[PDB]
Amino acid sequence: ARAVIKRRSPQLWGAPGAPIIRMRGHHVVWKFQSYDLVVEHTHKRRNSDIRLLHYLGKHCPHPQKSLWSPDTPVAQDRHLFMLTTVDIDAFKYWFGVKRCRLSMKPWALLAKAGLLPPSLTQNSKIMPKPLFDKESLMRYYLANRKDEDVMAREKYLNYENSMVKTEEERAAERPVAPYL
C-alpha cells in the first residue's frame, strides 16, 4: 500500500504481518558464521530487533568434532556434530497457540530435532511425486476405516483435553465423613 513500492524486499499483506520463525545472521567470512532462530514479524525494519517476538536459539552450521565427550570407539558417535539450541516452550507456544509461519531452513532444523516432520522442500530426487486416482483411494479407505467413536475419542485426546480422571482419583477427591 506504499505509493512507490520498496522493490527489493516485498511481502504478502500489511506489515507487521503474522509472526514467522526465521534463521538470520550477519554476513561474514564463512569460517565464523552463526545463525539465529527467531520468532519475529513478517515485515522487518533496519535492525531486526524492532520487531522481534522471541529468541529461539543459536545454530552453528559447522560440523564439529566432539571434544566434550571422551573419544569413543563407537562408530556413529565419532561422526562430526552439529550444534543447535532450541527453546521449545516458546516454540510450542508460538507455533501451537499463536499459529506462526515457518521459513524452510528452520523447518529442516526442527525436523532434525524431532519437533516437526521433514519439510516440503526436502526432496530425494530419486523418487517422483506420487499420482492419485479417487476410486483406488476409495477401495483402500473402505478396506480400512476405524470406528466412529474410536476416531472421535482419538481426536478428543489429541486436540482437546489429554489429562482425564480415572474413577479412582474421583473417589479419592470426594469429601469424607464430617462434611459427607
Binding site: 507455533f95 501451537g96 516432520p117 516440503l120 492419485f132
Partner: protein, 89 residues
C-alpha cells in the same frame, strides 16, 4: 509466484501483459495433483499445530496452579506477618 507457462492462453494486447493465466485442462489436472500431495503434508503439519496447542495449555494449567499454590501460601504468610506487626504496633 504463480507460475505462468508458455502454453497458457496468450493474450494479444499491446496495452498490457502478454500472457493471461488461463490453463490448458492438462495444467489444471496437474496442478490439482501436486496440490493434493502438499495437502498430504499440511494435514500432519496443522495436526501438530493443535497438538502442541493443547500440550502448551495443559502444561500451563499444571505449572500455573502449582504457582498459585506456592504464591497464595506466600501472600497468606505475608498478610499474617503484617496483621501481627500491627498488633505489636
Amino acid at each position: 509466484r504463480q507460475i505462468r507457462p508458455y502454453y497458457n492462453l496468450p493474450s494479444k494486447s499491446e496495452h498490457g501483459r502478454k500472457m493471461t493465466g488461463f490453463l490448458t485442462p492438462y495444467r489444471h489436472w496437474m496442478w490439482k495433483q501436486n496440490e493434493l500431495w502438499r495437502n498430504v503434508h499440511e494435514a500432519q503439519f496443522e495436526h501438530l499445530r493443535r497438538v502442541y496447542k493443547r500440550q502448551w495449555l495443559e502444561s500451563f494449567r499444571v505449572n500455573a496452579d502449582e504457582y498459585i499454590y506456592k504464591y497464595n501460601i506466600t501472600k497468606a504468610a505475608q498478610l499474617a506477618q503484617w496483621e501481627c506487626e500491627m498488633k505489636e504496633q
